[model samples]
Target: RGSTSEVIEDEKQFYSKAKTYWKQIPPTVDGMLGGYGHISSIDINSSRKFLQRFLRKTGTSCALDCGAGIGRITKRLLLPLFREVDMVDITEDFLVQAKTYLGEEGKRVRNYFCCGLQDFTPEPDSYDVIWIQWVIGHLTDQHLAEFLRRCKGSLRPNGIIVIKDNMAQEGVILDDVDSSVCRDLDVVRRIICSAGLSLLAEERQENLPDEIYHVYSFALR
Candidate 1:
């Protein structure tokens, strides 16, 4: 509402509260967290299955999970799917736990980035898939667009991106309590397009409550 700095500070406040609250919560489905809790098993596996189709199409050598809370995406999906899985998070507790939990296991685990999306500078032409899930809500429109602009440079020729996030019923929902925004599918697309990226494919999430209902998934390149 204020300036870029103000918006960022709001977002920071959101995460600060998030880290404190989330630190008290477990990192698993029992944690009753956002997507991981409500119908979480089906939600998690289904999204991975859908992404598997594209992984076959695009190749899956390396992947990065942006806002990868407690290695939810990394350990569950990306580690098994890709040769390498890198996780980025704004909170340190989960980042350290995920790195420690998945430590030297079957799937390769790259360390961590304890930073926000705006602070992320992706390695150019390094990743075959970059999975952005449930994290964009933390970013403002311009911040998101600019982040994607930098993200585009990191994708390889045979690569793509998978975006799975909550969708508002209509225009937008700004949760000041959490320092996040939920926008409609079209609004998300417009934000993506602002960075010269476009949708390659799209799908609605399989099952959700009437209250927390519509969520959307997109494949972008």
Candidate 2:
């Protein structure tokens, strides 16, 4: 069996191939949500309305999108809400697609192409909101810890980090028969608290049939 880091490294390579496959789709392709079919227009429009309400209640502007794969969620969900959106991705090909799709919004959007979480070097006290979607499950404990530590410095005093991803529920089969890759939600929550982030709210919902996603919001002290 491969070690955890080894498994993540393999995932990185696999994601590269996946991005290549995603890029083959023409830019004019319709109904494609960031080159994936996870979220629909209704879901995105509803989420945007909710986000706007939440931000008004909380008062925040700037936001960062970590592991913003091909701008699937970013283009539809985040662009309208945030004054400035910074996107970071390990896959260069995906970032290229994101830039093309989001650049029409002009300088309000920026891109960082990095190999890993630690590769980001944003200035301290920068963003009011940091959004991480579907990225944490790919990291090891050590990498996740280091990534959280780095994010701490990049956040404003009242910054909020929003994490959304599929969690291992009761009926979920995290690993396959080959024991390839998996995520532990309990371990993820522990690391979040251990990194000095205060949990604000968490919601676990069954978005798709047989798929449960846990969305968490954390605030910096």
Candidate 3:
């Protein structure tokens, strides 16, 4: 599926598989972290702290968990903090799992979407926070820009966008590199800026002993 097609189709399949894979495992903090068993405690704690800090600052009452596969991060991290959470994925199975797990939270979780990022159209200036993790790596440069633009239009005036993903940094070789994907850090920064978002904060940390990921916080201007 990643090999090629329209951008929307590619993301649909990628997120579908991601959601299916994550749901098969137990969904606890320890279980979630254990899913990525190679990662260290330092990385897990750092990521949680980073996300919690942003959630606090953004006043994230209503949050959109973009590409939320089987509610892995949503169930583990964001769901407990926000009063209202909306999750989106390209797979129906994933949404079903999310509903099963999160429905008991009452008004805390509203709905779920099984659609591509580019095709997703939320209410304008609605959400306080948009959380996307490990999802952007699947997008091409053009689709990435469009995704950010759509997100900008969907956020409230003072809303924040938090993105966490592994940047194809120097010396790191991901099995998923392709001609359309942006690997350079500078390219990613440029894309964020050009999309009319300002980088509020960013941090990099090693996940596993060898793998690294980047977490970025941006505000709509």
Highest-scoring model, TM-score? 1
Candidate 2 residue-wise lDDT, 103-143, digit = tens: 67735675555455545665688877777766665555566
lDDT per residue as tens, model 1, 99-205: 56676752476657788887799899988888898878777777888888877899988788888888877676766655676787777888888789878888888
- Residue clash pairs of candidate 1: none
Indicate whether candidate 1 or candidate 2 has the larger lDDT. 1
Q: For candidate 3, write residues 1-221 as lDDT tens digits.
A: 22123333465555455445555645443443435634535544665787666655567678888877667666656777777888887656667666676666734678787776766887788788788766675555567778888888888767778776666554223233321232446656777887878787777664344543444433343
Candidate 3 residue pairs in clash (backbone atoms < 3 Å)? none
RMSD of 1: 3.1
Badly placed stretches (over 4 Å) of model 1 are 1-25, 35-38, 103-107
Residue 74: error of model 3 in Å? 1.4
How much lDDT does each candidate structure score? 0.75, 0.59, 0.63
Off by over 4 Å in 3: 1-44, 54-57, 170-182, 211-221
Q: How much is 40 displaced in model 1, in angstroms?
A: 2.5
The better candidate by TM-score, 1 or 2, is: 1
Ranking by TM-score: 1, 3, 2
Tally clashing residue pairs in candidate 1. 0
What TM-score does candidate 1 reach?
Answer: 0.86
lDDT of 3: 0.63
